[PDB]
Design a protein around this ligand. Structure first.
Ligand SMILES: *[C@H](CS(=O)(=O)c1ccccc1)[C@H](CCc1ccccc1)NC(=O)[C@H](Cc1ccccc1)NC(=O)N1CCOCC1
Length: 215
């Protein structure tokens, strides 16, 4: 409903991270979503562990890729809904190789009970995000390597190959857009973020949206 929503402005989003040479975008998309949902459930903003998923989630393929929905399900069904803090299970896959899963010596930072899959409709996703928070979405990021700033009004929308986080939107601007948190350091794009035109399914953004459910 609101003309514009930016969850970073409410202090619901953690800092931009770095996945390195590991194809773990699915883990950053999933965890980034859990981080926001946890804060919105009335808990302090806590950095959670992507490494936990890359190393322990065997329903996915670590640095070779995975699905945000598989990750959410794994946390609930295999790890008792637990998500470790980042400082207790630091990221160590930046070189391209994921170390073995360690089942102890970690602290639980958040817990989830399940996940929901949003409709393939940008207006419906926006309405949900405006009230419930950031959404994990898959996009075609083949055009993203050359992105340097501004609203991307033209995006190659052919095949989903990347997982990111929708943190807001603005329908009031000249060209309405989505605000997306990426995981390629703050050196890429607009300090780690990218804005794409909203309304024409740019980069296939409405195809695979979902969010974890807390408490
Ligand atoms: C992350 C992608 S990326 O940030 O590396 C990237 C690379 C180039 C352009 C744009 C983004 C990750 C990469 C997986 C990978 C690793 C090595 C070589 C090739 C590919 N992408 C995924 O993990 C995607 C995410 C996704 C989520 C939901 C729907 C569709 C895609 N998943 C994916 O690649 N796999 C799904 C599970 O089976 C393995 C393939």
């Amino acid at each position: 409903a609101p003309a514009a929503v930016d969850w970073r402005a409410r202090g619901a989003v953690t800092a931009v991270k770095d996945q390195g040479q590991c194809g773990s975008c699915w883990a950053f998309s999933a965890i980034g979503n859990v981080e926001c949902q946890w804060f919105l459930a009335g808990h302090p903003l806590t950095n959670l562990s992507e490494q936990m998923l890359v190393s322990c989630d065997k329903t996915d393929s670590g640095c070779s890729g995975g699905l945000m929905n598989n990750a959410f399900e794994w946390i609930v069904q295999e790890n008792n809904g637990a998500v470790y803090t980042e400082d207790s299970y630091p990221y160590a896959s930046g070189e391209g190789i994921s170390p073995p899963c360690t089942t102890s010596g970690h602290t639980v930072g958040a817990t989830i009970t399940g996940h929901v899959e949003l409709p393939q409709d940008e207006a419906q996703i926006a309405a949900w995000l405006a009230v419930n928070g950031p959404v994990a979405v898959a996009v075609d990021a083949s055009s993203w390597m050359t992105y340097t700033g501004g609203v991307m009004t033209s995006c190659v929308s052919e095949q989903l190959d990347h997982g990111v986080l929708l943190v807001g939107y603005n329908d009031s601007a000249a060209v309405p857009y989505w605000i997306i948190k990426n995981s390629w350091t703050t050196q890429w794009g607009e300090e780690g973020y990218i804005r794409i035109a909203k309304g024409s399914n740019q980069c296939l953004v409405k195809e695979e949206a979902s969010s974890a459910v807390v408490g």
